[PDB]
Paper text:
Enterovirus 70 (EV70) is a human pathogen belonging to the family Picornaviridae. EV70 is transmitted by eye secretions and causes acute hemorrhagic conjunctivitis, a serious eye disease. The capsid of EV70 is composed of the subunits VP1, VP2, VP3, and VP4. The major capsid proteins of EV70 are organized with pseudo-T=3 icosahedral symmetry, with VP1 subunits forming pentamers around 5-fold symmetry axes and VP2 and VP3 subunits forming heterohexamers at 3-fold axes of the capsid.
The structures of altered and empty particles of EV70 were determined to resolutions of 3.7 and 4.3 Å, respectively. The empty particle of EV70 is structurally similar to the altered particle but has the interpentamer binding interface decreased to 1,650 Å2 and the rectangular pores on 2-fold axes of the empty particle expanded to 25 by 16 Å. This pore expansion is caused mostly by the loss of the structure of a helix formed by residues 90 to 98 of VP2. Nevertheless, the residues forming the helix, even though flexible, are still located in the vicinity of the pore. The best-resolved part of the capsid of the empty particle is the intrapentamer interface formed by VP1 subunits, showing that the contacts within a pentamer are more stable than those between pentamers. Although the pore located on a 2-fold axis of the empty particle may enable the exit of a single-stranded RNA, as was proposed previously for EV-D68 (56), we cannot rule out that genome release is enabled by particle opening, as was proposed previously for echoviruses 18 and 30 (43). Because of the low number of images of empty EV70 particles in our data set, we were unable to identify the presence of open particles in the sample.
Residue numbers in the entry:
A (entry chain C), D (entry chain C): 2 to 72, 79 to 169, 189 to 233
B (entry chain B), F (entry chain B): 34 to 42, 62 to 87, 102 to 241
C (entry chain A), E (entry chain A): 59 to 83, 93 to 133, 143 to 275, 283 to 290
G (entry chain C): 147 to 169, 189 to 194
The structure:
């Protein structure tokens, strides 16, 4: 060989796919171990739920930001995953911040922390891209919706296809027995679905 | 979930923690709670009567370095070692690790919601990158339990002490 | 899909050390390979509890004079071995020990370190102290199997009359990564290069 | 060919696996000879016994450091192969000093230099990792042990799996005839077993 | 397993010679290839009584001025042949004799010497004097078949007005090593580059 | 052991060395002891009666350059040439080569322990890197014998002189 | 009691626990 240099050289390119020359000529590495919790794709991570700050309002602090008290709207969630809002501190909103733009569906899961004897109907409704905010329950009743009765189903789940909002209102008032207080609480949670994809890396602004 | 049967290569029942509407949350470190290549499993339930309200997030975190506010100083012996007596979360929202409670569901998690179930159970297979730890001085898993929503219901004499009972077995442990 | 495979999420060559020293009318480096000297890669790495990888390392010099094509020596020093006292030391000669000599005007030097620990993977967090028994001076979580050696560097021709600063920049491309046990994202500023403590403080997202 | 240089070049890397250009175009080398004592692996060397300084105490000099006089403990051997101690001057402790960490089993062989008519029982006992030193023969009798009678077996051998100590006590007093003195002596020896492995080179501190 | 194969134990490129000379307002090298000029490689090599190997040699210059890209000549001189008197000598021209010219700013020069002796291997120790009969001046153990020639070097362009020191560093990678008859480790400091004498002195290990 | 039958490509019996409780040890160089491509074998035994105590390490070292304390000066003729008369170890613990006696077992070694056996034998095949040395001026092997544990037992008139008898054959020697 | 041979009787699921005694000190609760 001419023994000087190879073509496509005399640079350093920050993200290259070429190999390099090893220290320790045949040091055999310490073995593999078959432990669980393998991960192979970030999407396996982003598909796992997180709670979200449905109570991001300025009076709330610590854990209280993650729960809404039910004694008209209860919460109304700005639905962009990477702009500031409730989703900003979730696996969805953390992982995806590393990337240019995103595609595929989400789902929420709500959960109601009540006493077993307590019930009520909440309308949930969803505002597709370009929509206005449902001002009150009559626009939610005409909008794409689910009526969550806390009976049968302590923890409703609602897919979000591919944005405005998910919005949730006291359609009935609450009902509870004499032995359980009105300090009743909803938890809100979200993930991406199996169909999700993230396009092209751009380093996150949070740190 | 992590999908192992408890495996290598008799339960112990801790004294019940007196939860309250204000409580921040509790943790235990394994093996420290037993006083060892093992498949720990953890089985926790509430002594909660049907009027009661509120909910707990049960999580097992691997290699959970408890952090602290307001100093660069690392934790002492007595802050990290707690045996079966366990430790409090000084800041549950940061999970003490400066990480959101809201994202702790990436770790194997189960819910005690007092409508649906007062009981939850988790298998914690061996995660250590050495094959059988043998010294008293490390804790591969931390079991953590946090009041996501505050305890409620009852009146007067019932005094809101609604206990949590924790149980642990080092299932398939070898030495 | 692109940077959704974890090797592509992590495999961006990080500037893990950025430093300088002069030669004028001491002045050698000894930095241990732990990716805690730079905050972006700290967070991006901390999303996984255990990782197994080879490390490519690239060394790039740069000069402000007050070009001289000097010889730079890079040396890798293993976990817990002896390290030199000055620009001159018998350690820089070491027979059983990897090193590279390169000229400043050549394209920058590259090395591979194979996966280097007595444990099967790097445990990116560890909450213990020792492998046998603990003394008072054994700090919480600084595991010896995570020590990963150090890269040691000096100017070899430093007799020069001309007066200048060498800058060095060190880029690590962790490569061929296998990863285990994902983590909740680190959502808080970093006080130090050893533990995780902090002083946003009480509300992670805006109103 | 373009005839300038080849890719992966313009450096010298101290431990490289690449070939080089010969002086003497086809000088045929002086032949091979089939002589014994071939060696192919360092492990073939480290598997061969050495005596060890079981009598390292400050009064002992020259050969006396390798023998213990038997007229309560006789000797108690710190069992780390590469830290300072009796093993430090053995093939085990010399070869392994060139490497980062070690794995696999050892074995001791003791030997008793007595007169043929002389006998006694010595308990030997072994302290696994993290154990305390057996203070006297009652803890040795409860510890993992062998009782070496000098009858039948002038030279007991004891494997060490994979540390504290090997410890050896006058369980009986000695017995000897009128024609042989109490200047009776034990020799201690050690090697690694077939299972041994040494991971990664780091040059020895003894020279 | 890694550096347990003897070729990997020994095959680390040793800095076997480290020297300088000036040119200003004599000064050539003639060093014989014997690995006794540096103490670490002395010991690491002395663990075997006979070795057969090719030698790679790499030459690295370096400069302190008071860069000039000079031509350096390396020459190999065989066992017992004529050697030059000064920077200028007919020997530097030798027709039947290997040499390499290289420029200081090129990456450093490499050569292979094939295994070079009239004996089938290098006898790393030898206790005799001569192959026929002995005179008084024939020193104990300095065997002629072990002479292995010398590497000879000069600056070719040395007319320069500018004032400086050339440092040279010479790295030998003994390569493709076959070895015979292992030895008890040399546990004592080295007084000289010919025999093995000494002056730790009487107790090899600490108390 | 080295696994050759004595091979190329009548014994000689040296006068018995008078060992004592204090003795440092003795060596002989081959071929020098015979006064030649060969398989030397060496057969050494103690004239020790059953009361006696102590033990010898018997070793054959290839190319054993005897060193010395306290000078850079190389050995003279008379220091290295000793015929059958042999030489003393001035420092057995350094094996004179600045190498530990304790590690000399890497060389082909045998034990005379007076309980188990008063006799030991070694085969020393040709190691020279030239095929048949022919001059009087080199010694490929050194037979060495060292009191690892001091001679003992007996009383008074027995005077502790308990002899060593050495025997050598150049088996399969050709010229 | 937690280190002794034991059963934890939750009054949930099982209003009336039963425990065999093989063949003495106590049963303690």
């Amino acid at each position: 060989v001419p023994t000087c240099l190879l073509p496509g050289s005399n640079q350093f390119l920050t993200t290259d796919d070429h190999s390099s020359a090893p220290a320790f000529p045949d040091f055999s590495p310490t073995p593999e171990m078959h432990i669980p919790g393998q991960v192979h794709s970030m999407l396996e991570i982003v598909q796992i739920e997180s709670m979200m700050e449905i109570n991001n309002v300025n009076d709330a602090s610590g854990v209280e930001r993650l729960r809404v008290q039910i004694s008209q709207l209860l919460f109304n969630i700005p639905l962009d995953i990477q702009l500031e809002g409730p989703l900003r501190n979730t696996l969805l909103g953390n992982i995806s911040r590393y990337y240019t733009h995103w595609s595929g569906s989400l789902e929420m899961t709500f959960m109601f922390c009540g006493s077993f004897m307590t019930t009520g109907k909440l309308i949930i409704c969803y505002t597709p891209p370009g929509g206005s905010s449902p001002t009150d329950r009559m626009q939610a009743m005409l909008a794409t919706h689910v009526v969550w009765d806390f009976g049968l189903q302590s923890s409703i789940t609602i897919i979000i296809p591919w944005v405005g909002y998910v919005t949730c209102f006291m359609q009935t008032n609450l009902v509870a027995p004499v032995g359980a207080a009105d300090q009743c609480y909803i938890v809100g949670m979200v993930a991406a679905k199996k169909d999700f994809n993230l396009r092209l890396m751009r380093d996150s602004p949070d740190i | 979930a992590y999908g192992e049967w408890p495996t290598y290569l008799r339960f112990y029942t801790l004294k019940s923690k007196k939860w309250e509407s204000n409580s921040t949350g509790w943790w235990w470190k394994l093996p420290d709670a037993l006083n060892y290549r093992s498949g720990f499993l953890c089985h926790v339930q509430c002594n909660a009567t049907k009027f009661h309200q509120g909910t707990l997030l049960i999580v097992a975190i691997p290699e959970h370095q408890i952090g602290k506010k307001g100093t660069g100083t690392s934790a002492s012996f007595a802050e990290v070692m707690k045996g079966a007596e366990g430790g409090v979360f000084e800041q549950p929202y940061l999970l003490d690790d400066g990480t959101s409670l809201a994202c702790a569901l990436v770790y194997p998690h189960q819910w005690i919601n007092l409508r649906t179930n007062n009981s939850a159970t988790i298998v914690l297979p061996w995660m250590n990158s050495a094959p059988m730890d043998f010294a008293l001085r490390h804790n591969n898993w931390t079991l953590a339990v946090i009041p996501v929503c505050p305890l409620a219901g009852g009146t007067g004499n019932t005094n809101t002490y609604v206990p949590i009972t924790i149980s642990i077995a080092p299932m398939c442990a070898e030495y | 899909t692109a940077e959704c495979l974890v090797e592509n999420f992590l495999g961006r060559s990080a500037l893990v050390c950025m430093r300088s020293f002069e030669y004028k009318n001491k002045n050698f480096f000894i930095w241990t390979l732990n990716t805690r000297e730079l905050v972006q890669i700290r967070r991006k790495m901390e999303l996984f509890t255990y990782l197994r990888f080879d490390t490519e390392i690239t060394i790039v010099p740069t000069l402000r004079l007050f070009l001289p094509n000097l010889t730079l020596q890079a040396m890798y020093v293993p976990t817990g071995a002896r390290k030199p006292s000055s620009q001159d030391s018998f350690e820089w000669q070491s027979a059983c020990n990897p090193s590279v000599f390169f000229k400043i005007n050549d394209p920058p030097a590259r090395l591979t370190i194979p996966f280097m620990s007595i444990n099967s993977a790097y445990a990116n967090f560890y909450d213990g102290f020792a492998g046998f028994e603990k003394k008072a001076t054994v700090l919480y979580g600084i595991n010896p199997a995570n020590t990963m050696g150090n890269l040691c560097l000096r100017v070899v021709n430093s007799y020069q009359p001309v007066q200048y600063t060498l800058t060095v920049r060190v880029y690590m491309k962790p490569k061929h990564i296998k990863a285990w046990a994902p983590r909740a994202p680190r959502t808080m500023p970093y006080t130090n290069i050893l533990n995780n403590n902090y002083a946003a403080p009480t509300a992670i997202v805006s109103h």
